[PDB]
Amino acid sequence: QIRQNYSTEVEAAVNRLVNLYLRASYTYLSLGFYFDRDDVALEGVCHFFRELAEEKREGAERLLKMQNQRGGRALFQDLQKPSQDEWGTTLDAMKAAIVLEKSLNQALLDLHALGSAQADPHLCDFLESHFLDEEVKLIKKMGDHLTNIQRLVGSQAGLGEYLFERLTL
Template sequence: MNSKIHQNCFTEVEAAISCLVKMHLWASYTYLSQGFYFNLNDVALEGVGHFFHELAKEKHNAALLKEKNLNQALLELHGQGLPKQTPTSVNFWRATS
């Protein structure tokens, strides 16, 4: 009886990380829209627009960093698995490339 956990593990991890990156980008877009709103002339709060623009930049940069780290980790994993060509690793690399 074979377990399907091994086969679906990478897909589940990829989906979880993708969800995390999407949440950071969503937060970035939310802060950006709030920043534009508070920069309007008829809104009485000065400086709040700038604050939300800075938060948007931070969240966007964090999302890009997470995506970059994920890609780097995948490249390192590929480099480690390349010398050990097993049927399972070959299928894994085909699925992720």
């Protein structure tokens, strides 16, 4: 058929990466709707996480497309529910988001390493081009948000969270 230079080890890892991105999308959907609760009511934070839910879903879709293009076979698994039901303050959430992104980034790096070992340059380039750069930029932006939240919620935590939501997000 069309499959060429596409190992079963890479195929399986791409399937696992699809699951991790859909899991992340689901986490962001839960973060977003938590900040839209009447008793939380931070619309800018809700909007930030809803946008990330969409981006992670797009990530998954491009991986699946790539899997089909190389002749691998997509296999879906159960998607685990997010690690929490309530996500605390904006500070707590942005910390949980950075931890999540770093674990996706690490999965991307692990797949790139596997691609290198297997001499699969198309895999390596596809990750380089569509995932690694974007993760780095996103992680930087979250770290920046995290620094600003912290400087704000030193004293007067309520006031600080409100101003962050209104003036940054």
